[PDB]
Structure formats: structure tokens, C-alpha cells
Amino acid sequence: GQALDAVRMRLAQLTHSLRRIRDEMSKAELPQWYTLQSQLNVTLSQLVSVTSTLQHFQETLDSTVVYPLPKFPTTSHESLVTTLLRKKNIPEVDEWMKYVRETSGVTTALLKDEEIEKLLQQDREITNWARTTFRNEYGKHDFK
Amino acid sequence: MQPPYIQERLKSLNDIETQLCSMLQEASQVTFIFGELKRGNESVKPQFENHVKQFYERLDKSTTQLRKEIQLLDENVGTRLLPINVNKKALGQDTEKMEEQLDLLSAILDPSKSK
């Protein structure tokens, strides 16, 4: 419950920041650019913190089993229950996902040790080489 | 026109922002090339080292020369362009507007020069 409580408070403050940026964008007059940048950066880093904390406590969230209250009446609140207990993406995200699979050529249910595995090994090395090259370039010139 | 020193100072500054523009452009090409390098054609791999090296050397010496320009802002106080007092022009407007008027009178006084 502690992990979900932290999840709750952080998500609540994130929603509060979203409400903030909303009611300062809803004005007919746009404020100064700098205030918009500050709000954007704060809210966006807060979203990063949300993602990181959600990532930290995956096990507590997975262990929890959802069950309706005995006192909660489903006969009158079935619409509210079905609003919360359904969780599919917006279609423009699933069609974006399908277009991304098609554009990249990636598909992840039949892959085996032949050509794609030699390509996978031949990719690791470019990253390491580029990292070392830029470390060398940084070391070449004194930046202090 | 402005005295000598200011002209090369503005030329150096203009060179500074042109170098900054070149740095931005080279950042654009290096970002471009890294994309196809990640796509996995190795032909343009040698060009990557050259682009990175030129990008870094363009980033460094530009900032270095802008360091010299701010030293020159501090160091040129009352210096190189030494003071001069030979009548000060805010007053001496009375003197050029004396001289030229009499010149006009001369042109009026001589009827052979009014042609």
C-alpha cells in the first residue's frame, strides 16, 4: 500500500500541475514565452519522475488484485465501474503503433538465431565505438 | 566614418556569428549522417570522424576568439583611440556653419563662378 500511496500522491500533484498549465493556457491572452517554458519544463520533468517511480514499484502494483467493494452497488454504478475497468489505448495510438511496426519492419513473435542475430551483434559495436570516439574528441581539447 | 579600430572589431564580431552559424549547420549534417549510420550502411563511416572533429574545432576556437573580444572591451578604456580636443563638434557646429556660409557668399560675390 505504501508504493501505491506514493504513486497516488505523485500522480495527484502531476494532475494538479496539468490543471495549472490548463487554466493558464485557457486564457484568451497568451502569457510571456518564458513562463510557458518554465511550466513546460516543470510539468515534463514531473512526468519523468512519475514514469521513474511507476518503474520502481512494478512488483507492488502487480501483486495487488482488484476487487469491487461489497458495499459498492454495481446495479446503479455499472457505468462508472465500466468507465474505470476498461484500459485500451486511443485508436490513433494503436494505428500509430501499427504504422511504426510497418515503417521499422520490426515484428516480435518468430525471431530466431539466422541473419537478424548477426545484425543485432553488428549494432552493439557502433554504439560503443561512437561513445569512445566522442570521449576521445572531448579529451582532445581542454574544456576547463 | 568610424575610426579604424571599431571597423576590425565589428569584422571580427561578424566572423564570430558566421562561425556560430557554420557550427549550427555542421551540427545539422552530423545529426543527418548519424541517422543513416544507425540504419547500418558503413560507407559514410569515415566521414563521421571528420565531421565530429571539425564540429568540435569549430565550437572551440569561436568561443576562444569571443574571449579575446571581451578582453578587448575591458582593455581599450581610454586606449588606442587616444583623446582629442582640436574645438569640440557640439560647439563647433557654429564654426562649420560660419565657414560654409561665407563660402556661399564668395560664390555669390563672383559672377564668373555661377555657371
mmCIF file of C-alpha atoms in Angstrom:
data_model
loop_
_atom_site.group_PDB
_atom_site.id
_atom_site.type_symbol
_atom_site.label_atom_id
_atom_site.label_comp_id
_atom_site.label_asym_id
_atom_site.label_seq_id
_atom_site.Cartn_x
_atom_site.Cartn_y
_atom_site.Cartn_z
ATOM 1 C CA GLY A 1 0.000 0.000 0.000
ATOM 2 C CA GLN A 2 2.922 2.337 0.620
ATOM 3 C CA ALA A 3 4.072 2.128 -3.008
ATOM 4 C CA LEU A 4 0.564 2.796 -4.309
ATOM 5 C CA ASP A 5 0.249 5.659 -1.808
ATOM 6 C CA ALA A 6 3.407 7.282 -3.183
ATOM 7 C CA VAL A 7 2.062 6.603 -6.702
ATOM 8 C CA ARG A 8 -1.154 8.341 -5.645
ATOM 9 C CA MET A 9 0.419 11.477 -4.198
ATOM 10 C CA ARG A 10 2.838 11.938 -7.098
ATOM 11 C CA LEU A 11 0.050 11.330 -9.715
ATOM 12 C CA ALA A 12 -2.145 13.793 -7.806
ATOM 13 C CA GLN A 13 0.491 16.523 -7.931
ATOM 14 C CA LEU A 14 1.059 15.751 -11.621
ATOM 15 C CA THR A 15 -2.671 16.164 -12.255
ATOM 16 C CA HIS A 16 -2.580 19.411 -10.272
ATOM 17 C CA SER A 17 0.236 20.688 -12.498
ATOM 18 C CA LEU A 18 -1.795 19.658 -15.549
ATOM 19 C CA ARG A 19 -4.795 21.592 -14.206
ATOM 20 C CA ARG A 20 -2.467 24.557 -13.669
ATOM 21 C CA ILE A 21 -0.992 24.606 -17.173
ATOM 22 C CA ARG A 22 -4.566 24.143 -18.421
ATOM 23 C CA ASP A 23 -6.071 27.145 -16.680
ATOM 24 C CA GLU A 24 -3.145 29.355 -17.656
ATOM 25 C CA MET A 25 -3.453 28.253 -21.288
ATOM 26 C CA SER A 26 -7.246 28.691 -21.357
ATOM 27 C CA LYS A 27 -6.882 32.477 -21.073
ATOM 28 C CA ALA A 28 -7.687 34.420 -24.232
ATOM 29 C CA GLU A 29 -4.290 36.163 -23.971
ATOM 30 C CA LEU A 30 -1.075 34.156 -24.153
ATOM 31 C CA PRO A 31 1.403 34.957 -21.346
ATOM 32 C CA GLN A 32 5.123 35.536 -21.846
ATOM 33 C CA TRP A 33 7.168 32.820 -23.549
ATOM 34 C CA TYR A 34 9.421 32.288 -20.522
ATOM 35 C CA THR A 35 6.575 31.433 -18.136
ATOM 36 C CA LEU A 36 5.361 28.864 -20.662
ATOM 37 C CA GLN A 37 8.853 27.347 -20.832
ATOM 38 C CA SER A 38 9.081 27.165 -17.043
ATOM 39 C CA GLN A 39 5.677 25.491 -16.755
ATOM 40 C CA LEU A 40 6.510 23.086 -19.591
ATOM 41 C CA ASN A 41 9.851 22.041 -18.108
ATOM 42 C CA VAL A 42 8.484 21.646 -14.572
ATOM 43 C CA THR A 43 5.460 19.593 -15.637
ATOM 44 C CA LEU A 44 7.503 17.499 -18.068
ATOM 45 C CA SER A 45 10.232 16.661 -15.542
ATOM 46 C CA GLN A 46 7.421 15.842 -13.113
ATOM 47 C CA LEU A 47 6.087 13.412 -15.722
ATOM 48 C CA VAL A 48 9.591 11.924 -15.867
ATOM 49 C CA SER A 49 9.508 11.450 -12.094
ATOM 50 C CA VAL A 50 6.075 9.836 -12.461
ATOM 51 C CA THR A 51 7.471 7.374 -15.000
ATOM 52 C CA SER A 52 10.535 6.583 -12.880
ATOM 53 C CA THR A 53 8.554 5.988 -9.684
ATOM 54 C CA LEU A 54 5.991 3.835 -11.587
ATOM 55 C CA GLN A 55 9.006 1.824 -12.901
ATOM 56 C CA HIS A 56 10.420 1.433 -9.343
ATOM 57 C CA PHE A 57 7.372 -0.216 -7.738
ATOM 58 C CA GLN A 58 6.135 -2.513 -10.539
ATOM 59 C CA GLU A 59 6.032 -5.523 -8.129
ATOM 60 C CA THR A 60 3.706 -3.934 -5.565
ATOM 61 C CA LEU A 61 1.368 -2.800 -8.373
ATOM 62 C CA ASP A 62 1.461 -6.301 -9.988
ATOM 63 C CA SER A 63 0.826 -8.119 -6.643
ATOM 64 C CA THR A 64 -2.359 -6.082 -5.916
ATOM 65 C CA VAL A 65 -5.614 -7.821 -7.022
ATOM 66 C CA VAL A 66 -8.568 -5.566 -7.984
ATOM 67 C CA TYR A 67 -11.955 -6.407 -6.433
ATOM 68 C CA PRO A 68 -15.148 -4.332 -6.108
ATOM 69 C CA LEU A 69 -16.495 -3.415 -2.695
ATOM 70 C CA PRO A 70 -19.312 -5.475 -1.162
ATOM 71 C CA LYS A 71 -20.924 -2.162 -0.199
ATOM 72 C CA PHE A 72 -20.363 -0.627 -3.643
ATOM 73 C CA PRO A 73 -23.563 -1.145 -5.676
ATOM 74 C CA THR A 74 -22.922 -2.232 -9.258
ATOM 75 C CA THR A 75 -26.599 -2.113 -10.277
ATOM 76 C CA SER A 76 -26.614 1.700 -10.141
ATOM 77 C CA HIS A 77 -22.914 2.407 -10.821
ATOM 78 C CA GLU A 78 -22.180 -0.170 -13.536
ATOM 79 C CA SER A 79 -21.432 2.640 -15.996
ATOM 80 C CA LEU A 80 -18.907 4.152 -13.579
ATOM 81 C CA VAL A 81 -17.338 0.726 -12.985
ATOM 82 C CA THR A 82 -17.049 0.041 -16.744
ATOM 83 C CA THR A 83 -15.518 3.541 -17.230
ATOM 84 C CA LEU A 84 -12.624 2.682 -14.854
ATOM 85 C CA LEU A 85 -12.191 -1.113 -15.516
ATOM 86 C CA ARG A 86 -11.529 -0.697 -19.330
ATOM 87 C CA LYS A 87 -7.999 0.296 -20.395
ATOM 88 C CA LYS A 88 -7.421 0.084 -24.229
ATOM 89 C CA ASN A 89 -5.336 2.858 -25.933
ATOM 90 C CA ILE A 90 -6.900 5.613 -28.101
ATOM 91 C CA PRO A 91 -7.130 4.200 -31.715
ATOM 92 C CA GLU A 92 -4.731 6.890 -33.060
ATOM 93 C CA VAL A 93 -2.010 5.379 -30.747
ATOM 94 C CA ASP A 94 -2.672 1.760 -31.870
ATOM 95 C CA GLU A 95 -2.694 2.741 -35.584
ATOM 96 C CA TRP A 96 0.490 4.817 -34.903
ATOM 97 C CA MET A 97 1.993 1.657 -33.286
ATOM 98 C CA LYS A 98 0.984 -0.439 -36.379
ATOM 99 C CA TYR A 99 2.432 2.233 -38.754
ATOM 100 C CA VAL A 100 5.672 2.228 -36.630
ATOM 101 C CA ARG A 101 5.895 -1.634 -36.860
ATOM 102 C CA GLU A 102 5.321 -1.397 -40.656
ATOM 103 C CA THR A 103 7.824 1.527 -41.141
ATOM 104 C CA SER A 104 10.577 -0.113 -38.996
ATOM 105 C CA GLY A 105 9.902 -3.685 -40.298
ATOM 106 C CA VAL A 106 10.047 -4.900 -36.616
ATOM 107 C CA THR A 107 7.760 -7.823 -35.524
ATOM 108 C CA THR A 108 8.425 -9.788 -32.306
ATOM 109 C CA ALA A 109 6.951 -13.309 -32.322
ATOM 110 C CA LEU A 110 9.036 -15.596 -34.720
ATOM 111 C CA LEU A 111 12.679 -14.300 -34.372
ATOM 112 C CA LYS A 112 15.482 -16.976 -34.271
ATOM 113 C CA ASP A 113 19.319 -17.275 -34.255
ATOM 114 C CA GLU A 114 19.902 -16.607 -38.533
ATOM 115 C CA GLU A 115 20.607 -13.173 -40.175
ATOM 116 C CA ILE A 116 18.743 -10.828 -37.709
ATOM 117 C CA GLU A 117 21.029 -12.125 -34.870
ATOM 118 C CA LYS A 118 24.242 -11.212 -36.833
ATOM 119 C CA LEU A 119 22.722 -7.739 -37.482
ATOM 120 C CA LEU A 120 21.890 -7.493 -33.712
ATOM 121 C CA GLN A 121 25.566 -8.264 -32.825
ATOM 122 C CA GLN A 122 26.836 -5.842 -35.568
ATOM 123 C CA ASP A 123 24.747 -2.977 -33.982
ATOM 124 C CA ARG A 124 26.272 -3.111 -30.368
ATOM 125 C CA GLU A 125 29.713 -2.139 -31.628
ATOM 126 C CA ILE A 126 28.726 1.071 -33.445
ATOM 127 C CA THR A 127 27.321 2.459 -30.187
ATOM 128 C CA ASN A 128 30.455 1.573 -28.216
ATOM 129 C CA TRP A 129 32.723 2.925 -30.963
ATOM 130 C CA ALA A 130 30.823 6.220 -31.170
ATOM 131 C CA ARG A 131 30.904 6.624 -27.390
ATOM 132 C CA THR A 132 34.667 6.028 -27.320
ATOM 133 C CA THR A 133 35.195 8.363 -30.290
ATOM 134 C CA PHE A 134 33.347 11.224 -28.619
ATOM 135 C CA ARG A 135 35.196 10.600 -25.355
ATOM 136 C CA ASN A 136 38.439 10.927 -27.322
ATOM 137 C CA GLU A 137 37.197 14.090 -29.053
ATOM 138 C CA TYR A 138 36.246 15.632 -25.704
ATOM 139 C CA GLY A 139 39.654 14.714 -24.290
ATOM 140 C CA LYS A 140 41.455 16.199 -27.296
ATOM 141 C CA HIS A 141 40.591 19.814 -26.436
ATOM 142 C CA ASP A 142 40.932 21.277 -22.943
ATOM 143 C CA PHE A 143 37.477 22.494 -21.909
ATOM 144 C CA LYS A 144 38.493 23.802 -18.464
ATOM 145 C CA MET B 1 33.107 57.179 -40.920
ATOM 146 C CA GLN B 2 34.143 55.325 -37.766
ATOM 147 C CA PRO B 3 37.841 55.260 -36.737
ATOM 148 C CA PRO B 4 39.993 52.252 -37.755
ATOM 149 C CA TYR B 5 39.776 50.144 -34.542
ATOM 150 C CA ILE B 6 35.957 49.737 -34.482
ATOM 151 C CA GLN B 7 35.881 48.501 -38.082
ATOM 152 C CA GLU B 8 38.061 45.463 -37.482
ATOM 153 C CA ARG B 9 36.279 44.877 -34.127
ATOM 154 C CA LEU B 10 32.941 44.631 -35.987
ATOM 155 C CA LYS B 11 34.546 42.473 -38.686
ATOM 156 C CA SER B 12 35.790 40.071 -36.002
ATOM 157 C CA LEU B 13 32.348 40.004 -34.381
ATOM 158 C CA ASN B 14 30.704 39.282 -37.747
ATOM 159 C CA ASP B 15 33.182 36.452 -38.264
ATOM 160 C CA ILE B 16 32.126 35.210 -34.820
ATOM 161 C CA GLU B 17 28.448 34.876 -35.641
ATOM 162 C CA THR B 18 29.212 33.434 -39.087
ATOM 163 C CA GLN B 19 31.303 30.779 -37.339
ATOM 164 C CA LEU B 20 28.383 30.114 -34.988
ATOM 165 C CA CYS B 21 26.096 29.645 -37.998
ATOM 166 C CA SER B 22 28.634 27.253 -39.520
ATOM 167 C CA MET B 23 28.688 25.314 -36.244
ATOM 168 C CA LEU B 24 24.894 25.005 -36.294
ATOM 169 C CA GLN B 25 24.975 23.863 -39.920
ATOM 170 C CA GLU B 26 27.628 21.237 -39.181
ATOM 171 C CA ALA B 27 25.519 20.058 -36.249
ATOM 172 C CA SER B 28 22.712 19.608 -38.771
ATOM 173 C CA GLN B 29 24.872 17.490 -41.088
ATOM 174 C CA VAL B 30 26.253 15.360 -38.243
ATOM 175 C CA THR B 31 22.724 14.724 -36.966
ATOM 176 C CA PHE B 32 21.784 13.819 -40.547
ATOM 177 C CA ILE B 33 24.682 11.393 -41.010
ATOM 178 C CA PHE B 34 24.165 9.639 -37.664
ATOM 179 C CA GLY B 35 20.691 8.605 -38.827
ATOM 180 C CA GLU B 36 21.910 6.540 -41.755
ATOM 181 C CA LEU B 37 24.869 5.337 -39.683
ATOM 182 C CA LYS B 38 22.268 3.868 -37.333
ATOM 183 C CA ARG B 39 20.433 2.464 -40.454
ATOM 184 C CA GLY B 40 23.613 0.357 -40.975
ATOM 185 C CA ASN B 41 25.399 1.405 -44.190
ATOM 186 C CA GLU B 42 29.098 1.662 -43.332
ATOM 187 C CA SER B 43 30.238 3.615 -46.409
ATOM 188 C CA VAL B 44 29.845 7.033 -44.756
ATOM 189 C CA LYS B 45 31.548 5.845 -41.567
ATOM 190 C CA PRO B 46 34.895 7.592 -42.344
ATOM 191 C CA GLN B 47 33.127 10.922 -42.912
ATOM 192 C CA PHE B 48 31.759 10.753 -39.359
ATOM 193 C CA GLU B 49 35.155 11.216 -37.699
ATOM 194 C CA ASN B 50 35.938 14.211 -39.914
ATOM 195 C CA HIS B 51 32.552 15.804 -39.240
ATOM 196 C CA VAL B 52 32.859 15.330 -35.471
ATOM 197 C CA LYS B 53 36.408 16.707 -35.379
ATOM 198 C CA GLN B 54 35.523 19.750 -37.488
ATOM 199 C CA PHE B 55 32.404 20.365 -35.375
ATOM 200 C CA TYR B 56 34.398 20.355 -32.140
ATOM 201 C CA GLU B 57 37.196 22.524 -33.538
ATOM 202 C CA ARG B 58 34.582 24.989 -34.827
ATOM 203 C CA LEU B 59 32.917 25.064 -31.407
ATOM 204 C CA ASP B 60 36.174 25.699 -29.532
ATOM 205 C CA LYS B 61 38.036 28.424 -31.430
ATOM 206 C CA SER B 62 34.895 30.535 -31.902
ATOM 207 C CA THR B 63 34.422 30.744 -28.137
ATOM 208 C CA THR B 64 38.157 31.378 -27.797
ATOM 209 C CA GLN B 65 38.062 34.381 -30.159
ATOM 210 C CA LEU B 66 34.925 35.717 -28.396
ATOM 211 C CA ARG B 67 37.104 35.562 -25.144
ATOM 212 C CA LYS B 68 39.655 37.900 -26.841
ATOM 213 C CA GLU B 69 36.822 40.306 -27.859
ATOM 214 C CA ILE B 70 35.651 40.684 -24.188
ATOM 215 C CA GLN B 71 39.297 41.222 -23.047
ATOM 216 C CA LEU B 72 39.461 43.987 -25.709
ATOM 217 C CA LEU B 73 36.225 45.571 -24.291
ATOM 218 C CA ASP B 74 37.939 45.730 -20.846
ATOM 219 C CA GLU B 75 41.428 46.765 -22.117
ATOM 220 C CA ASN B 76 40.501 49.562 -24.629
ATOM 221 C CA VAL B 77 39.137 52.022 -21.957
ATOM 222 C CA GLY B 78 40.625 55.433 -22.964
ATOM 223 C CA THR B 79 43.224 53.441 -25.005
ATOM 224 C CA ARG B 80 44.498 53.146 -28.672
ATOM 225 C CA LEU B 81 41.912 55.786 -29.743
ATOM 226 C CA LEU B 82 43.545 58.461 -27.526
ATOM 227 C CA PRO B 83 41.578 61.685 -26.654
ATOM 228 C CA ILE B 84 41.395 64.798 -28.871
ATOM 229 C CA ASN B 85 40.304 68.437 -28.250
ATOM 230 C CA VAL B 86 41.308 70.250 -31.555
ATOM 231 C CA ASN B 87 37.116 72.920 -30.740
ATOM 232 C CA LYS B 88 34.567 70.123 -29.775
ATOM 233 C CA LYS B 89 31.939 69.461 -32.541
ATOM 234 C CA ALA B 90 28.763 70.059 -30.417
ATOM 235 C CA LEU B 91 30.045 73.687 -30.089
ATOM 236 C CA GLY B 92 31.995 73.681 -33.438
ATOM 237 C CA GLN B 93 28.739 73.249 -35.421
ATOM 238 C CA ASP B 94 28.774 77.114 -35.115
ATOM 239 C CA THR B 95 32.154 77.138 -36.988
ATOM 240 C CA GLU B 96 31.407 74.886 -39.994
ATOM 241 C CA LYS B 97 28.073 76.836 -40.274
ATOM 242 C CA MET B 98 30.154 80.040 -40.215
ATOM 243 C CA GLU B 99 32.648 78.847 -42.858
ATOM 244 C CA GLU B 100 30.280 77.381 -45.410
ATOM 245 C CA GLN B 101 28.017 80.427 -45.338
ATOM 246 C CA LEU B 102 30.891 82.724 -46.256
ATOM 247 C CA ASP B 103 31.866 80.285 -48.998
ATOM 248 C CA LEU B 104 28.379 80.725 -50.431
ATOM 249 C CA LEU B 105 28.842 84.494 -50.288
ATOM 250 C CA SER B 106 32.041 84.082 -52.300
ATOM 251 C CA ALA B 107 30.086 82.151 -54.927
ATOM 252 C CA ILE B 108 27.521 84.953 -54.850
ATOM 253 C CA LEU B 109 30.227 87.629 -54.898
ATOM 254 C CA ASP B 110 31.927 86.331 -58.052
ATOM 255 C CA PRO B 111 29.530 86.271 -61.045
ATOM 256 C CA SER B 112 32.002 84.296 -63.191
ATOM 257 C CA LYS B 113 31.718 81.198 -60.966
ATOM 258 C CA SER B 114 27.899 80.985 -61.096
ATOM 259 C CA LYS B 115 27.740 78.615 -64.049
#
